[PDB]
C-alpha cells in the first residue's frame, strides 16, 4: 500500500484542546516548523506540540517521520500554479516551471535537501508537475532515454543553482555572515592567492566571484536560456 | 586570518596514550568517521574518541566543527589525481575531472551535502582542482561571466547526477530497501497510476525509470557527452 493511496482515517477529535486532527493539518503544521527550523526539527513530537495534540494521535495519520517528509514535499509542490497543459512554446513552459520551482525552494529551503535523495515522490502534486515538464518535450520524436536525459539536464541546472542560493541563505542564518560579508573578509586572503601567481584562473574570475555584475535572479535566467538553447539543439538533430 | 593560512601549532604530545597530535591527523580521523557515519556523527568529541585524545587537545588544532568540515572537504579533494595541466583536449580534461569527482563523492558521500552549500572552499586542493577545470575553458576567448556560466553548467550536471546516486545509496543504508527493491514494491501503485490515464508521461517513461537499459556509469557518461557537445557549441558561437 502506497502512502499515496493509504486510506486516511476519519477526522478524530482528541481530549487535549478537543480539536479535530487530519493528515493534511499535520503536514501543514510540519511544513510551518520546517520552514523556520529545518526538516530535522520537525519531529513528530515537535509537530504534535505545534498542534496541541498528543504525539500518538499524529501517528494514527502519518506512521513515520519519513512518511511525514514525503507528504510535506508533495504538499508544498501543490503551491506551484502552472497551467493544466504546457502549450506550444516549450521554452516558455520550461521557463515558467523553473521560475516557480526556484521560488518554491526559496520558500521551503529544506527542499534543497529533501527533494530526491533517493526515491521519487509519486504523490499527486509531484506527478502533476512532472507531467507538465515531461509534457513540454514529449511532443517531439525522442526515445524515452533521450527525453529523460534532457529533462535531467534541465532539472540539474535548476536544482544546482537554487541549492547554492539556499546554501548561502542557510549559512547566513547559522553564522550571521552573509555572502557579501564573507567575500569582504576573504579579500586579504584572496589577494595573497592572487599575488602568489599559483592560481591564474582564480585571479581571473575573482572580481566576478566576489561582486558579480549580475544578481542571482539575472544569472538564473541567463544560464537557463543557454540551457534551453542547447536542448533546442538536441531537438534539431532529432 | 584564513583557516588556510592559520599557523598550525607544533605537534603536541598528550598524557592520554602519550601520542602526538597534528591538524591533518585530526582531519583524517574525522574523514574516516564521516565516511561510515556522516558529517554529523563526526563531532569534535567523537573524533577525539577515535584518536584516544582529550577533546580539548583537538581544539588547539581545529577551533570549530565548521572549520573541521572545511578541512575535511579539502583533504578528500586531495585524493583526486588529475595532471598538473589539462592539455589541449578540453573535452578529455573535463571528462577525467568529472570521473574523478564522481568517484570522490561516491567514496565520501557526505560531500553530496558538504560541497558548496554556502561559501567556496579555498584550500589548496580545491584551488588546484578548480584551476584545472577553469583552465580547460580559459584558453578560449570568453568573458569571465561566460566562463563561469559554462563551468557552472558542467559542475551542476556532475553534482546533480552524483547527488542522486548518493541519495539512493544513503537511503538503502538507512532503510535497507535499495533502488531495485523500491521499484519492485512500487510496481502495483505505478500500474494504478498508469491505468488511471491521468499521467501519460509517467506511463511513457516508467519502464526506463523502473529498470533502465543503461546503468548509472553509462548514463553519467552519455549525459556528460551531451553536456560537452553543447559547451562545444557555445564555444563555436564565440
CB-CB neighbors (< 8 A) of B134 in chain A: 201-202, 204-205
Q: Which CATH number fits domain B77-238: 1.10.357.10, 3.60.20.10, 3.40.50.920, 2.40.420.20?
A: 1.10.357.10
CA distance A199 to A197: 6
CB contact under 8 Å between A160 and B148, yes or no, is no
**Domains of chain A: which residue ranges?**
1-76, 77-238
Listing DSSP states for chain A in one string gives --TTTSPPPPPEE-SSTT-EE-HHHHHHHHHHHHHHH-TTT--HHHHHHHHT--HHHHHTT--SHHHHHHHHHHHHHTT----SS--S-HHHHHHHHHHHHHHHHHH-TTHHHHTTSSSPP-SHHHHHHHHHHHHHHHTS---HHHHHHHHHHHHHHHHHHHHHHHHHHHHHHHHS--HHHHHHHTHHHHHHHHHHTS-HHHHHHHHHHHS-SS-HHHHHHHHHHHHHHHHHHHHHH-
Q: Is B99 on the interface with A (CB under 8 A)?
A: no
Query: Which residues of A carry a binding-site annotation?
Result: 229
If contacts are CB pairs under 8 Å, which of residues 161-220 in chain A contact chain B?
A: 161, 163-164, 166-168, 170-172, 175, 179, 182, 186, 189-190, 192-193, 198-202, 204-205, 207-209, 212-214, 219
Q: By what technique were these coordinates determined?
A: X-ray
- Min Cα–Cα distance to chain B from A180, Å: 10
Contacts of A71 (CB under 8 A, 6+ apart): A3, A23, A27, A30, A62, A123
C-alpha to C-alpha distance for A84 and B115, rounded to whole angstroms: 37
Q: A13 forms bridges with which residues in the sheet?
A: A20
**Cell output for B48:** 577525539
How far out from the chain centre does Cα A10 lie?
32
Resolution of this deposited model, Å: 2.0
Which chain B residue lies closest to A187 (C-alpha atoms)? B2
> How far apart, in whole angstroms, are the C-alpha atoms of residue B226 and residue A150?
9
For residue B52, how many other CB atoms are within 10 A of its CB? Answer: 12
- Chain B residues with CB under 8 Å of A219 CB are 149
Cα A130 off chain centre by:
14
3-state secondary structure at position B171: helix
CA distance A71 to A82: 20
Q: Which of helix, strand or coil describes residue B7?
A: coil
Is residue A218 within 8 A of residue A165, CB to CB? The reply is: no
- Grid cell digits, residue A23: 493528515
Cα angle B118-B122-B127, degrees, rounded to a multiple of 5:
125
**Beta strands B20-21; B12-13: pairing state:** antiparallel
A139 in B contact zone (CB under 8 Å): no
Cell of B100: 574523478
Q: B1-76 and B77-238: same fold?
A: no
Topology (CATH level 3) of domain A1-76: Arc Repressor Mutant, subunit A (1.10.10)
Cα-based angle A114, A165, B65 (whole degrees, multiple of 5): 75
CA distance B22 to chain A (A): 23
Distance CA B86, CA B67 (A): 30
Instruction: Read off the C-alpha cell for A126.
Output: 509531484
**Total CB pairs under 8 A between chain A and B:** 178
What letter would DSSP give residue B238? Answer: -
For residue B147, the chain A residue with the least C-alpha distance is A205
Length of chain A: 238
Give the span between the Cα atoms of A206 and B30, in whole angstroms. Answer: 31
Residues in chain B: 238
User: Cα–Cα distance between A47 and A52 in angstroms, integer?
Assistant: 9
Query: Is A199's CB within 8 Å of B131's CB?
Result: yes
Please tell me the distance from the alpha carbon of residue A230 to that of residue A129, in angstroms, as a whole number: 23
Cα B44 to its chain centre, rounded Å, is 22
Cell 579533494 appears where? Answer: B77
Q: Which three cell numbers stand for residue B129?
A: 582542482
Distance CA(B193)–CA(A154), nearest Å, equals 25
d(CA A22, nearest CA chain B) in Å: 23
Amino acid at each position: 500500500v502506497s502512502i499515496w493511496m493509504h486510506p486516511e482515517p476519519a477526522g478524530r477529535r482528541s481530549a487535549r484542546s478537543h480539536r479535530t486532527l487530519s493528515r493534511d493539518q499535520i503536514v501543514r503544521a510540519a511544513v510551518k516548523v520546517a520552514d523556520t527550523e529545518g526538516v530535522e526539527a520537525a519531529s513528530m513530537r515537535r509537530v504534535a506540540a505545534e498542534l496541541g495534540a498528543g504525539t500518538m494521535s499524529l501517528y494514527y495519520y502519518v506512521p513515520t517521520k519519513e512518511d511525514l517528509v514525503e507528504l510535506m514535499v508533495d504538499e508544498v509542490i501543490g503551491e506551484t500554479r502552472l497551467p493544466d497543459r504546457p502549450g506550444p512554446d516549450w521554452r516558455a513552459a520550461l521557463t515558467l516551471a523553473a521560475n516557480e520551482k526556484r521560488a518554491l525552494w526559496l520558500r521551503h529551503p529544506w527542499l534543497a535537501t529533501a527533494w530526491r535523495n533517493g526515491h521519487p515522490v509519486w504523490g499527486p502534486n509531484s506527478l502533476r508537475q512532472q507531467e507538465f515538464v515531461l509534457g513540454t518535450l514529449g511532443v517531439f520524436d525522442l526515445q524515452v532515454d533521450e527525453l529523460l536525459s534532457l529533462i535531467g539536464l534541465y532539472n540539474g541546472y535548476v536544482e544546482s543553482f537554487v541549492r547554492n542560493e539556499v546554501g548561502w541563505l542557510e549559512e547566513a542564518r547559522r553564522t550571521k555572515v552573509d555572502m557579501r560579508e564573507w567575500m569582504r573578509r576573504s579579500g586579504p586572503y584572496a589577494q595573497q592567492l592572487v599575488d602568489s601567481g599559483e592560481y591564474p584562473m582564480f585571479a581571473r574570475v575573482l572580481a566576478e566571484t566576489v561582486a558579480p555584475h549580475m544578481g542571482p535572479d539575472q544569472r538564473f535566467r541567463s544560464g537557463l536560456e543557454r540551457l534551453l538553447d542547447s536542448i533546442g539543439a538536441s531537438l534539431d538533430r532529432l
